[PDB]
Design a binder for this molecule. Structure first.
Ligand code: NA
Length: 231
């Protein structure tokens, strides 16, 4: 499915920074009105300081649409996961903590269930052609491959992985990992500049396609994206 996405800073919709206004709820409602079955939010305020996690806003947004929302941004602790779920989010998106503390995160899978968690991994293809995991675009590689990290979590029932390519190559990347782990539903993130980019991901095996900036830029609509995806 198409997964429309917003990044939020202090109640403001931003592009990665350009301000697109303070109306995230009507934006999300219109995404759902066009047929979206899942939405994605990044709490950039929470990511910079978990003390200022935008829980009240997230509550309002989840309540205001009829579809599951997955939410990430500075999820560091079990308390963070619980607080987001309590606010009504469908799934919590875990990023750097899934790389840095796998035994701790494996415990979260046991407590909350695999249906409640999405692991978001940034992947950089190195000189050798290895899929290297990094915790962000501006930090060096972490010394573990995508495959190695996925296999760390398969024993606790990993089901959802969001993969962002931060290094043609894009499509091959998703074809390979989806083929290797058909029991995992992979989501693609990044590299969607126009409608043809969505077409290209078709048949790769990816289950979900995150689309953020291209919608804000008015390149195409959620309805058009879904029609392309469904072919
Ligand atoms: Na966005």
């Amino acid at each position: 499915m198409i997964i429309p996405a917003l990044d939020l800073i202090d109640g403001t919709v931003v592009r990665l920074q350009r301000d697109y206004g303070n109306d995230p709820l009507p934006r999300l409602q219109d995404y759902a009105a066009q047929g979206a079955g899942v939405l994605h939010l990044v709490d950039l305020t929470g990511a910079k300081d978990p003390a200022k996690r935008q829980i009240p806003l997230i509550k309002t947004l989840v309540a205001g649409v009829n579809v599951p929302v997955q939410v990430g941004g500075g999820v560091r602790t079990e308390e963070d996961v619980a607080a987001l779920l309590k606010a009504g989010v469908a799934r919590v998106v875990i990023g750097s903590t899934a790389v840095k503390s796998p035994d701790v995160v494996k415990g979260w899978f046991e407590r909350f269930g695999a249906q409640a968690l999405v692991l978001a991994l940034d992947v950089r293809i190195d000189e050798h052609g290895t899929k290297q995991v990094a915790v962000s675009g501006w930090q060096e590689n972490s010394g573990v491959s995508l495959e190695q990290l996925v296999e760390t979590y398969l024993p606790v029932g990993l089901k959802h992985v969001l993969c962002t390519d931060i290094s043609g190559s894009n499509v091959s990347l998703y074809e390979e990992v989806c083929a290797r782990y058909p029991q995992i539903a992979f989501q693609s993130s990044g590299g969607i500049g126009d409608i043809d980019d969505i077409a290209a991901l078709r048949g790769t095996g990816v289950r979900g396609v995150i689309v953020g900036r291209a919608l804000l830029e008015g390149k195409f609509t959620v309805k058009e994206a879904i029609q392309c995806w469904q072919n």
